[PDB]
Design a protein around this ligand. Structure first.
Ligand SMILES: CCS(=O)(=O)c1ccc(Nc2ncc3cc(Cl)c(=O)n(C4CCCC4)c3n2)c(C)c1
Length: 289
């Protein structure tokens, strides 16, 4: 609304485009997500329920403005996401204390949302915002269900859990833990874990690494909707080849977040007690804003 002055386009995506905005009344710098609605009464309640989500590791939804065929969402503004930070460290590598602090902070925000029965669904490095004080926050939570922008926004697929790719309709909190494990491996190796091009290439890249799942490790996988008995049967690779710098504690923790069975996958709460975070600290990054 005229109360906000658009400064620059900082993003674009699913039916939504995000601007850096300045509240002309208060002077506050905020993130303004514009969603062309062409109004779901059910949705604007769940949006109002995420306004109550309150945690230092979650980008705060400040205000919800419904005006005509548009839904404006005002968020707390941050200057950089984890994707821009990983690119700026592709040659040097993020130090493990900074990686460990980040993973610890994201597991806290995940443990907060999951205790409120709130999924993120669409966890990716572009959705993880960082500041200069060493904090990292979860951003842009995906609703369970506007007009798509024609200018358009592939990398969401790289972090999808295998249960979503196999056609499970009822997601659990384990889908967010899987995405975090892929992000955790990407931070260490400075390379995407499963950079697939299609739904089946994403599935087969996971199969080539973790082995093709069966009823032994994932009971009920053969009864999943998009499962096919004609899947190739690949052998599981060694975890020391997946993340070849990481220590045994991290590889252990990463292996539990990458379990095929969502019921065997580690929860955010249990992950916080993993010995990998025994010496967890909070270092500061070197950001160029
Ligand atoms: C552009 C790459 S970057 O690293 O330069 C960069 C990254 C982040 C931000 N800021 C920022 N601040 C607050 C939010 C709040 C929400 Cl909800 C949100 O979705 N996003 C974006 C993340 C997904 C697309 C919009 C936000 N972005 C800036 C200025 C640059």
């Amino acid at each position: 609304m005229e109360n906000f002055q658009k400064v620059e386009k900082i993003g674009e995506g699913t039916y939504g485009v995000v601007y850096k905005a300045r509240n002309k009344l208060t002077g506050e710098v905020v993130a303004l997500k514009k969603i062309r609605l062409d109004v779901p009464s059910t949705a604007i309640r769940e949006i109002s329920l995420l306004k109550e989500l309150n945690h230092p590791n979650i980008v705060k939804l400040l205000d919800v403005i419904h005006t005509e065929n548009k839904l404006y969402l005002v968020f707390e503004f941050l200057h950089q996401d984890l994707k821009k930070f990983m690119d700026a460290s592709a040659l040097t590598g993020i130090p493990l204390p900074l990686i460990k602090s980040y993973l610890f902070q994201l597991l806290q925000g995940l443990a907060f949302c999951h205790s409120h029965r709130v999924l993120h669904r669409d966890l990716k490095p572009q959705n993880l915002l960082i500041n200069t004080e060493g904090a990292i926050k979860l951003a842009d939570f995906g609703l369970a269900r506007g007009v798509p922008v024609r200018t358009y926004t592939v990398v969401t697929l790289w972090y999808r859990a295998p249960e979503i790719l196999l056609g499970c309709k009822y997601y659990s909190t384990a889908v967010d833990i899987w995405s975090l494990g892929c992000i955790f491996a990407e931070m260490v190796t400075r390379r995407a874990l499963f950079p697939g091009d299609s739904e089946i290439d994403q599935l087969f890249r996971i199969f080539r690494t973790l082995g093709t799942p069966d009823e032994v490790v994932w009971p009920g996988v053969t009864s999943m909707p998009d499962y096919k008995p004609s899947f190739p049967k690949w052998a599981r690779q060694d975890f020391s080849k997946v993340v070849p710098p990481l220590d045994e504690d991290g590889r252990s923790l990463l292996s539990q977040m990458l379990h095929y069975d969502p019921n065997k996958r580690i929860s955010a709460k249990a992950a916080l007690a993993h010995p990998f975070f025994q010496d967890v600290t909070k270092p500061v990054p070197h950001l160029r804003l």
